[PDB]
Each structure stands twice: as C-alpha cells, then as structure tokens.
Write a protein that binds this DNA or RNA. Structure first.
Lengths: 92, 91, 92, 88
DNA sequence: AGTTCGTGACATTGTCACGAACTACG
DNA sequence: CGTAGTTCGTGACAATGTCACGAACT
C-alpha cells in the first residue's frame, strides 16, 4: 500500500490519547480532540479500542460520558513510556 | 492508512527504522527486520516511501543493497524525535 | 577421475581456479565461473576440495561468501607452477 | 582426491613428450613421463581419434607420433598456458 | 474512499544435492 | 572390464526485492 502522512509519522494518534489522560487524570473525547490536536472521529473509534482491551473505563457522570485510564491501561502506559524514552538515550 | 494496530500502539514502524538507521548508520531492509522485530515486508514498504521522498538511498554493495539516512533523512529524525520529547518528559 | 576431455587438455579447472584467485585475491563461484569460463557446478565443486583440504577459506560479506587462498595453498601454486614452467621451456 | 595431477592433466604430460621426442611408444612414454601404462595408451586413443597423434608400426613395434594439427594445437595452447603463469 | 499493515505468490542468484557420462588406472 | 574420482546439467532451498491481497485505520 501507499504511505502518505504528514500527520502521524513517528507518533501514532493512539499515543497522544494516553499521554493526555495521564496528567489530565480523566477527560472526554470532546476536549481531547483539540487539546491534543487529534481529529474527533479519529479519536473516538480509537478510544473504543482502549475500552476494548481494558485501557479506558467509562463514567457518565451525569449528562455526559467521561473517559479514564484504568490500571492495566496505566500499567502499560508506563510500560511503553520507558521503551519509547529508551530509543532516545541512543541519539543524544 | 492504518497507523495504529495492536502492537504499534505508541510508535509507527517509520519510527524504529530511522532510530535503528542511526546506531549503525546503515542496515538493510531485511537486516532491519530481525532487529526492530518489524515484519519484513512491512519494513520494505516504508523503505520505498523513504527514498521517493528522499529520506534514504540504496547504497550498492556488490550484489547486496544497503540503505542510508540522507542528510535530508536526519533532519526529520532530529526533528520528529523532538516532538516525542515534549510529550514523554512532562511525566 | 575425470581429469581430461575435448577442451580440457593441459590445464585442469583447479589450474585457473587457484590462479584466478592469485590474479585477483578473492571471488565468488559467481565471479570465478564467469571469468575462468568454467561451469559453476565445477567451480563450486573444486572449491569444496579446496576448503575441505586447507588451501582456501571462506569469507562472508554478510551473505556474500568470498573465497580467499591461504598459505600452504598458494605457497603451493608457486611450488607447483614451476612443475609447469619448466615442462614448457623445452618448447622455445 | 587427486594426488599428482592437480594442475597439469596426465594427457598434458604426454602431448609434450611427443614434441622433443617426435616419435614414441606407449610404454616408452609410460616409463619416462611417469604415468601408469593404462592411462598412457587410452589418452593416446583419444589423441588419434581427435586427429592429433598417429601410430607408426615397424614389426610389432608401435610408435605413436604427434601430427601436424596435433602440433598446431600444442602451439596455440602452450601460448595460453604461458599467459597463465606470466600473470602473477 | 484513501490509506497501509503484513501474508502469500512471483521472477531472481548463490550454494548444496542427486544423477549421467567419462576418465584414471589396476 | 571394474571401482574410484570428476566434469556438469537439472533440481531442491534458502535468502533479497516486486507484485497483488485482504484487512483494518484515518
């Protein structure tokens, strides 16, 4: 297939989401989509994936739907965070 | 395209390739594979992209073909690798 | 063995084989055969006798397996080429 | 596994013997050129078949001798044996 | 729709492998 | 005439890139 992106070269969109929900604590698709630059419907059906393999849980707190990291969602967040930090100690 | 799959959660293959291309200077399309654990045919497909856009070129070595980040292809590297630092740092 | 036929009259294949390598230094069965005009299944073969003896040794450029001549192997060619050179001076 | 024939063919040794000796018998050639009788006569049969050598029989005395075209090959080819050893 | 992993089906050279034809030499 | 040692074509295999697919992401 054809490669052509100028958006997600090194970084996956699936990535920003994680790093976002890390110190925002919790959030929803609505604001994630313009804090982290990443388009809204590229956001949600990707969230469903995290929801699916147990990385995000759901809290309609009232009239809304709130997204969160769960603890295996966090147990990998850190697990990859270091793997990716480590490909950086080689080129500096 | 499909950038995010179940094992390229954080980084694309285009990441590991150029990262590895820096530690040896040059590795083959095939050589890269058992070192970045990326499936071989996935590697080549990005490889052709890398030279059409001019990031890398096929440096001839007898019968075998070698591959080099061009000066062009390190400008992206040190640039893209900066974007990830502004993220996995505020941790 | 099958040492001589129609166009194999004075010099064996090993003749140009060990000589080839002297002239250049190191080559594949590919490079050898293409120049010494010896069919490859003959180049490959004589080479095994060379390696399994101790005249020639392998030399891989990753997956490019060149063949270099050793010590007793070309200190042989020299010793041996005169058992040639003087059986020919009776012809000038 | 080869022993004394590593660069020069046995057939070679023979073809040069009939140069300075001109006329020759198998056993004649066999003894001095250092080759078991069987190989001598056999490679000779090839040479005569290819039109390179000729039997010369005087009694029950068979003397093989190198023909002209047998000599013409030995020349044009000794020249290539040469350019082999010269390239050092 | 456009994109893009990554298996699978091709069209290549480089080296070992079985088999045919013949030479070396008792 | 017979066993041994050989020259080679054809065949079986392992290692690159292309070609074309199916499948899921943007």
């Amino acid at each position: 297939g054809k490669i052509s992106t100028d958006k997600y070269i090194f970084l996956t969109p699936r990535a920003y989401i994680i790093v976002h929900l890390l110190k925002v604590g919790k959030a929803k698709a609505s604001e994630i989509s313009e804090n982290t630059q990443i388009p809204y419907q590229t956001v949600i059906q990707n969230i469903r994936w995290l929801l699916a393999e147990g990385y995000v849980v759901k809290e309609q707190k009232g009239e809304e739907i709130y997204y969160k990291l769960t603890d295996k969602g966090k147990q990998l967040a850190t697990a990859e965070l270091e793997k990716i930090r480590k490909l950086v100690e080689v080129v500096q």
